[PDB]
Design a protein around this ligand. Structure first.
Ligand code: HEA
Ligand code: HEA
Ligand code: CN3
Ligand code: PCF
Ligand code: PCF
Ligand code: PTY
Ligand code: PTY
Ligand code: PTY
Ligand code: PTY
Ligand code: PTY
Ligand code: CUA
Ligand code: CU
Lengths: 236, 64, 51, 268, 78, 530, 55, 57
């Protein structure tokens, strides 16, 4: 979607794959505030209450009854927190029953989608690039370095399946509102399967560095309805 | 005895000489982006309101 | 340094007894180290059109 | 007595005079690395500054080594612990140079353990023909198994005290290694695939490539182990310049056997 | 209602890297057109697969390496 | 003198270069953060080159020319001769090439920018970005050689430390009784040995794929660029567990000196300190979760790099146990070592959030990573480098450092670099990518907050130069007036003042029993322990 | 043969150890000739390598 | 078995009798050609196995 100035949280979840991340980023940070709540307290009871202790208790070294306690204590939260971290890995490769195959190939300064599934009646793939609009050709009201000229349409409530690669320098494919992030290796290709559940445009960014034009590569993607998408596919 | 205040008067006079030195390098700065001056930011909101970008949350995009 | 473990004689500086004041030769070692990216921002802009 | 004890060193560990070959080798490693990156991009015209950089570096090693043998046999702070210092300082060093092979073995298990798409589905691919292990590469394993049975046939023979087996037993091992350079010069002159022959052409002249770049220094290590034993430098109770040569070769049986099983046997 | 159709799970390549899925379906189609040709409908399940999940420059590549006989894969089953 | 082989005078040359490379490594980060002050290229005119050159020009001066030669060279060549009981190092002639290749590692890097191209490859020098079809000139040719000169100095600079500790101790110094700063570097020396030859093949193969076109990494030929992502990062995660284990040695000495108490669980602190080093080998692709690994391979690493947080919890809770009972003397090394215990551990909680394969897929290459690894580099390896300089500066130089002026240098580092690196977690949780000269306009919020702070921290560093001037000129006139603190251990409650000057230094290490400065032969007799 | 002979010369020599060989006077002045050229000519071409002037 | 291969190299260096068999794309790569000469493959290479004839066609 769109980033917000002076924001501090995730972009809005438009994918159950993205919606799983927000319930795992908060499942982790609930067990990170007990540890930060302990250390910020156990360092204020020492600097304040024990800087005025002139007699140092210099005969407590081993502590066998507390040595074994804080070595199972990182072994009791991590055994708990991994079970919501295993249930997200094995349930984010769900490419069992897909519905659509779209491509995304980045040639170091743009992307190049093709809708090579031949549900379209013309029987040809629809390839189109995605260049960012420069500041000289900037229409007043467009987002700078976040709005391309040729966007990309995807239906809603559909089991899509991307294929992401490149023919040059590695640079990845990141939409934060959908939770999709794959490398676009030059020699090989990667897939993601992200069911979008709401109509609206998502803007993303390319994360991995490519060269001089790393800032000049957005990934614009809007979601329309399935009859409304087909009116675009029978045109182009 | 008169030294804990000299600590807190070097901290609070180091932040002032930091920010006061920041303005000299900004006034010797290049011309900023054209997409920030509160009116580009305004018309990029009903463009998002007509698309429902952030439904729950804020898509204000306004920071002149 | 091989011998003379004095006070200033484990450092290859010449702190006291210098002809010139030491703040010339001390800030002049650490500001010169500060001004090396500001000549990498000079001969790479002037070569590439900018100034 | 104590008056002579106040005229000597009281700790067994060695103290070295300030030598300037520390900054001589450092200036050579600058003019190695700087000049090998210029002639790849021009600015000179001729490829001989790298040949200069291989000459000033290697004569700086023997001038470093001339001061060390001046300390080894002519000044002598080599006690039991200092003898154990270098003998563990070199035995722990070759753990690093056996791990750099794992930076080259692991590329061979990166293009053959999982088949790729730019090449064929077989390793070695079509168009590329490999040499069977029932050929002249099998001579390369037996000539080191004979080397591994003559480096210890002359290890204890120097300690044994007779110079008929100690001197002559290292000349027959030295020419057993220069003859190993020339049979790894056949596959550098008669094999089909080259260094630029894709990924099979890359790692094959790297895993066996670095095994060829160590015999130029191993034969140069025998080049002083015969000169010093003829000029009576090495002894039969204290030998560091001879002991580092044997462990340079007794571990070489292990790495070449691991190099032979996957590059040739599993590599066809 | 649901007019869309594409290739399913393909359990022999279940990982994220689907490059051998793009490669072998180019192989299994062009091995079918030369050997055991009796119909096209079980032979176009490997044609409809490799049009999906494959870039256009790669199909231009695989039809150019095939043309000079420099196809690195086994193209001739016969 | 230039080529003296004394290990004392080499480590003062190490420290003389780690500030010169420091004031160059942070002047580049000044211009980097000046360009992220506002959208649109302000000071760089329109050049997105010389920004992937300055980022690699800054990130390698900080890693390989500041924190490597100070915590291993600047201290390890001064303290491991001294604390163990040696007279100097075991190999003192190669001790001088381990320093004098580092200015030659600088001429191989500053000239890598002045040439016509500029190595715009980033710190992780990736193969198709740095290939000869992408980067043409001799810029990246020198940037892969200055990384090789430091790879070879700090390799023989750790063979110098395995055959120093194993045989060159004193009489009663058994293998279970050593200072923890030595067990830091001796454990580190078994990671410097077993990760740098992995790196030296992972760079030379990129050299072969650039002017000898061998195609280890070239795509036309089947050479993966993804082999680089597991071969460089096999060096990379042990490398960042080498900038922190000597950082775990200095803090274990400071926090148990300025608290008059031995450290809690010393035998527990040496077994959980190699287990960080050993298990750090087995986790090296947590950086590359998104690069297309298997669903069980990522399932192994999301459980295996969380176990690095098992021995680090032991090495922190014991530092919260070694100061519980004892006194606290809040001087400047105690201020750094007590803010290290809060800002490094907050750089650990962001570690285990990034450690998951189920959560790195919304965080890779964002600014949430740069918020995480700067709480453990400029706050875990500068907070233990400032706590190591101030802890051994008047003992080694002989002159005290104006203690009332080193407290304001601590707070301008504490709150003047937390203001930079705390809002980075907010720009990255939205998804701002890295290494970019410009950004979408919604990321102008915190990038002006993090830009006001880089003048705060680099005004404290300008003050730290003046502390280095006050310490060398009239640093003798500091311990005769009330400017500094002289005795780092104040006497006990029932210890009379006239009996304290007989038994002054109640240290647990040899480092303070020596003279200030120590002699050119501080060990001419075999000392004895217990 | 020369091991005891050189040991009279090396021990109690009052010379730098890299000047303590009898066959060492000719080892240095040609070596200082190739050292006085191999550290300037890789660096004198650097202002030639800044203006694009290559070969 | 050396002599039966020493005579085998004399066949390929004599005549190809049509042309080369048009080697694959990974076997010959010449991105950034070599620097000590003009197009030399390595320090020493005989044309009995390293002919490298260009097939533009
Ligand atoms: C040792 C590691 C180290 C240290 C200390 C720092 C310190 C700093 N770094 Fe850097 N940085 C990196 C390592 C480090 N960095 C790396 C690896 C990258 C990623 C590059 C890449 O992957 O693209 C990076 C990237 C990076 C970015 C780009 C983010 C991205 O693209 O990924 C930015 C921009 O904000 C930045 C800023 C800073 C700042 C403001 C400091 C400030 O802390 C500096 C100012 C503070 C000081 C005043 C203290 C230090 C000064 C000294 C001289 C040390 C004192 C020691 C002695 C004198 C005893 N760093
Ligand atoms: C220099 C020091 C340093 C240290 C010590 C660490 C320590 C850790 N790092 Fe980090 N890391 C870097 C520096 C460092 N890192 C750098 C430079 C990068 C890459 C940036 C680049 O590529 O440019 C990086 C990258 C990096 C990534 C890659 C992200 C990405 O690029 O996509 C990940 C993810 O797994 C990670 C995780 C960790 C973890 C789990 C630890 C753990 O060791 C820390 C664990 C510590 C604790 C958790 C706190 C103390 C313990 C407790 C109080 C008790 C136990 C805790 C609980 C039970 C919760 N690091
Ligand atoms: C590339 C390298 C560049 C390096 C440049 C870095 C510059 C940093 C300089 C810092 C410095 O030198 O300060 C130390 C100096 C001596 O202190 P001391 O430790 O001997 O103890 C003094 C006694 O114990 C208490 O001193 P007292 O309390 O009596 O004086 C009050 C003093 C306190 O206020 C401040 O510190 C901020 C103004 O105010 C003044 O003097 C105002 C006079 C105009 O204290 C001073 O007197 C500072 C005066 C102001 C100097 C300019 C400040 C700019 C930010
Ligand atoms: C003395 C001169 C005062 C100048 C007037 C002023 O307030 O200037 C605001 C400056 C400049 O801010 P700027 O908007 O980036 O100006 C440069 C714009 N260019 C030219 C690059 C297009 O911005 C600043 O100086 C920083 C303003 C924000 C920080 C406010 C103070 C915070 C102090 C916190 C202390 C605790
Ligand atoms: C720091 C300074 C640099 C240190 C590393 C330098 C080592 C690399 C030098 C390479 C020089 C060169 O041009 O090598 C070419 C050789 C010859 O290859 P070739 O002659 O084409 O072999 C094919 C046989 N034909 C078909 C001709 C019959 O091809 C080879 O076999 C190359 C052999 C060398 C392999 C080096 C492996 C590197 C691993 C990391 C080492 C780091 C230390
Ligand atoms: C372990 C530590 C690692 C660092 C963790 C980084 C943050 C983790 C995420 C927690 C963020 C919670 C913020 C909640 C929030 O939405 O407040 C924002 C405002 O707060 C503010 O502007 C002030 C932010 C204060 C947050 C302090 C966070 C401390 C960590 C625990 C809490 C909302 O603002 P908005 O985005 O709706 O504004 C739109 C303008 N159009
Ligand atoms: C966890 C996070 C910890 C963060 C840092 C805290 C540092 C605490 C250090 C405290 C001193 C360690 C210690 O050994 O104290 C022992 C008792 O404390 C303890 O036993 C600590 C309490 C352990 C948890 C409570 C165990 C159940 C107690 C039931 C009470 C209700 C005293 O040992 P000593 O003086 O008794 O030994 C005499 C044998 N003659
Ligand atoms: C007095 C009038 C002359 C200028 C100073 C005004 C004092 C009030 C603060 C405004 C000064 C100023 O320009 O900085 C403002 C931000 O406030 C700050 O950064 C802190 C200002 C106080 C220190 C800019 O804010 P802005 O809205 O004035 O304009 C900004 C460009 N558009
Ligand atoms: C390849 C890169 C190698 C890097 C360094 C490898 C060094 C390994 C050996 C370490 C030397 C041990 C040592 O001090 O032995 C002394 C001399 O050895 C030596 O001088 C060994 C010299 C090795 C030369 C080979 C390296 C390059 C050769 C030239 C280019 C070809 C003899 O001590 P001692 O035991 O004889 O004392 C008996 C007096 N009675
Ligand atoms: C890789 C470099 C060699 C690694 C092993 C070095 C440690 C074992 C060899 C050794 O002890 O001799 C060193 C000299 O070698 C060297 O300094 C020669 C290495 C540098 C030139 C490499 C030339 C390669 C051809 C130490 O020298 P020392 O004088 O400190 O030992 C004083 C002895 N009592
Ligand atoms: Cu393409 Cu970054
Ligand atoms: Cu890591």
């Amino acid at each position: 979607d769109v980033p917000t100035p002076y924001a501090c949280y995730f972009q809005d979840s438009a994918t159950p794959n993205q919606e799983g991340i927000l319930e795992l980023h908060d499942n982790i940070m609930f067990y990170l505030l007990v540890i930060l709540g302990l250390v910020s307290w156990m360092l204020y009871t020492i600097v304040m209450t024990y800087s005025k202790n002139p007699i140092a208790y210099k005969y407590i070294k081993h502590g066998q009854t507390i040595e074994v306690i804080w070595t199972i204590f990182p072994a009791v939260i991590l055994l708990i927190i991994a079970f919501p971290s295993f249930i997200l890995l094995y349930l984010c490769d769900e490419v069992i029953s897909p519905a659509m195959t779209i491509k995304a190939i980045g040639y170091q300064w743009y992307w190049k989608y093709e809708y090579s599934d031949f549900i379209n009646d013309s029987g040809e793939t629809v390839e189109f690039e995605s260049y960012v609009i420069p500041d000289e050709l900037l229409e007043e009201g467009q987002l700078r370095l976040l709005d391309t000229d040729t966007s990309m349409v995807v239906p809603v409530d559909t089991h899509i399946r991307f294929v992401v690669t490149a023919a040059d320098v590695i640079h990845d494919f990141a939409i934060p509102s959908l939770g999709i992030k794959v490398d676009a290796t030059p020699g090989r290709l990667n897939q993601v399967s992200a069911l979008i559940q709401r109509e609206g445009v998502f803007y993303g960014a390319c994360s991995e560095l490519c060269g001089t034009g790393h800032a000049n590569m957005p990934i614009k993607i809007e979601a329309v309805s399935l009859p409304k998408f087909l009116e675009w596919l029978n045109e182009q | 005895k008169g030294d804990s205040s000299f600590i807190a008067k070097g901290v609070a006079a180091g932040l002032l000489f930091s920010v006061g030195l920041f303005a000299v390098v900004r006034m010797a700065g290049g011309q900023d982006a054209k997409t920030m001056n509160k009116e580009w930011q305004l018309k990029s909101d009903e463009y998002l309101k007509s698309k429902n970008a952030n439904p729950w949350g804020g898509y204000s995009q306004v920071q002149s | 340094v091989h011998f003379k473990d004095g006070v200033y004689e484990n450092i290859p500086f010449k702190v006291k007894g210098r002809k010139t004041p030491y703040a010339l030769s001390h800030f002049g070692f650490f500001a010169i180290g500060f001004a090396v990216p500001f000549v990498a921002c000079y001969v790479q802009l002037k070569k590439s059109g900018a100034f | 007595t104590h008056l002579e004890r106040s005229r000597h060193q009281q700790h067994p560990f060695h103290m070295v005079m300030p030598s300037p070959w520390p900054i001589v080798v450092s200036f050579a490693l600058l003019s190695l690395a700087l000049s090998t990156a210029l002639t790849m991009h021009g600015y000179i015209g001729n490829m001989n500054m790298v040949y200069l950089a291989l000459f000033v570096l290697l004569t700086s090693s023997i001038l470093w080594f001339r001061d060390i043998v001046a300390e080894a046999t002519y000044l002598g702070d080599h006690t039991m612990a200092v003898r154990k210092g270098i003998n563990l300082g070199f035995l722990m060093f070759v753990l690093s140079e056996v791990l750099i092979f794992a930076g080259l073995f692991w590329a061979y298990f990166h293009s053959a353990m999982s088949p790729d798409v730019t090449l064929g589905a077989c390793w070695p691919p079509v168009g590329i023909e490999a040499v069977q292990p029932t050929e002249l590469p099998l001579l390369n394993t037996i000539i080191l198994l004979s080397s591994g049975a003559t480096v210890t046939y002359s290890h204890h023979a120097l300690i044994a005290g007779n110079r008929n087996k100690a001197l002559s037993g290292l000349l027959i091992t030295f020419w057993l290694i220069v003859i190993f350079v020339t049979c790894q010069y056949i596959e550098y002159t008669n094999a089909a695939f080259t260094i630029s022959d894709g990924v099979y052409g890359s790692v094959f002249y790297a895993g066996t490539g670095l095994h060829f770049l160590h015999m130029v220094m191993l034969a140069a290590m025998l080049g002083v182990n015969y000169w010093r034993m003829r000029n009576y430098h090495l002894t039969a109770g204290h030998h560091v310049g001879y002991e580092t040569t044997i462990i340079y070769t007794h571990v070489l049986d292990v790495i070449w056997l691991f190099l032979y099983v996957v590059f040739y046997w599993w590599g066809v | 209602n649901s007019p869309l159709h594409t290739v399913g799970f393909d359990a022999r390549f279940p990982q994220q890297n689907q490059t051998k899925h793009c490669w072998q379906s180019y192989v299994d189609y062009h091995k079918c057109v030369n050997m055991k040709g009796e119909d096209f409908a079980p032979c176009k399940v490997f044609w409809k697969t490799y049009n999906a999940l494959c870039p256009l420059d790669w199909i231009e590549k695989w039809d150019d390496q095939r043309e000079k006989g420099i196809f690195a894969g086994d193209i001739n089953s016969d | 003198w230039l080529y003296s082989t004394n290990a004392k005078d080499i480590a003062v040359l190490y420290f003389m270069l780690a500030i010169f490379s420091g004031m160059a490594g942070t002047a580049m980060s000044l211009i980097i953060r000046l360009e992220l002050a506002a959208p649109g290229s302000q000071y760089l005119h329109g050049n997105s080159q010389l920004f992937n050159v300055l980022v690699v020009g800054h990130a390698v001066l900080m890693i390989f020319f500041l924190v490597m030669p100070a915590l291993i060279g600047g201290f390890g060549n001064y303290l491991l001769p001294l604390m163990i009981g040696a007279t100097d190092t075991a190999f003192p002639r190669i001790n001088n090439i381990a320093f004098w290749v580092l200015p030659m590692g600088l001429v191989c890097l500053v000239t890598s920018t002045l040439v016509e191209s500029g190595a715009g490859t980033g710190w992780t020098v990736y193969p198709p970005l740095s290939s000869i079809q992408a980067h043409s000139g001799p810029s990246v040719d020198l940037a892969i050689f200055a990384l090789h000169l430091t790879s070879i100095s700090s390799l023989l600079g750790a063979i110098n430390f395995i055959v120093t500790t194993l045989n060159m101790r004193t009489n009663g110094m058994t293998m279970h009784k050593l200072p923890l700063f030595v067990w830091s570097i001796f454990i580190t020396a078994f990671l410097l040995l077993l990760s740098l030859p992995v790196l030296s093949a992972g760079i030379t193969m990129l050299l072969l794929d650039r002017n000898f076109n061998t195609s280890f990494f070239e795509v036309s030929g089947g050479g993966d660029p993804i082999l680089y992502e597991h071969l460089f990062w096999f060096f990379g995660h042990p490398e960042v567990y080498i900038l922190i284990i000597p950082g775990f040695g200095i803090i274990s000495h400071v926090v148990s000196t300025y608290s008059k108490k031995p450290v809690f669980g010393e035998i527990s602190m040496v077994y959980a300190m190699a287990s960080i080093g050993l298990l750090g080998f087995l986790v090296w692709s947590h950086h590359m979760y998104i690069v297309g690994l298997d669903a069980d391979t990522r399932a192994y690493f999301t459980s295996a790099t969380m176990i690095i947080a098992i021995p680090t919890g032991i090495k922190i809770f014991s530092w919260l146990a070694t100061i519980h009972g004892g006194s606290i003397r809040l001087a400047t090394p105690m201020l750094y070592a007590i803010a290290f215990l809060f800002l490094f551990t907050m750089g650990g909680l962001t570690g285990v959030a990034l450690a998951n394969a189920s959560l790195d897929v919304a965080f890779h290459d964002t600014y949430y990573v740069v918020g995480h690894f700067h709480y453990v580099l400029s706050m875990g390896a500068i907070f233990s480098l400032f706590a190591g300089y101030y802890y051994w500066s008047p003992q080694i130089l002989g002159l005290n450092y104006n203690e009332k002026l080193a407290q304001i240098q601590f707070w301008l580092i504490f709150i003047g670099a937390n203001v930079i690196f705390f809002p980075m977690h907010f720009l990255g949780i939205n998804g701002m990518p890295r290494r970019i000269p410009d950004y979408p306009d919604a990321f102008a919020g915190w990038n002006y907050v993090a830009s006001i702070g880089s003048f705060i921290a680099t005004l404290s560093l300008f003050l730290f130069i003046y502390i280095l001037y006050d310490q060398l000129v009239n640093g003798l006139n500091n311990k005769v007036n009330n400017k500094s603190v002289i005795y780092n251990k104040a006497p006990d409650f029932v210890e009379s003042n006239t009996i304290f000057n007989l038994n002054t230094v109640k240290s647990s290490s040899i480092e303070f029993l020596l003279t200030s400065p120590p002699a050119v032969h501080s060990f001419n007799t075999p000392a004895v322990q217990s | 043969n020369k091991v005891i002979q050189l040991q009279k010369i090396f021990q109690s020599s009052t010379k730098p150890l890299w000047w303590r060989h009898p066959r060492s006077a000719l080892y240095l002045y040609p070596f200082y000739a190739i050292f006085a050229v191999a550290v300037v000519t890789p660096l004198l071409y650097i202002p030639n390598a800044i203006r694009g002037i290559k070969a | 078995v050396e002599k039966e291969h020493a005579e085998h190299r004399e066949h390929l260096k004599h005549v190809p009798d049509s042309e080369w068999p048009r080697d694959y794309e990974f076997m010959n790569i010449r991105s950034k050609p070599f620097f000590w000469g003009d197009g030399d493959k390595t320090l020493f290479w005989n044309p009995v196995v390293n002919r490298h004839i260009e097939h533009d066609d």
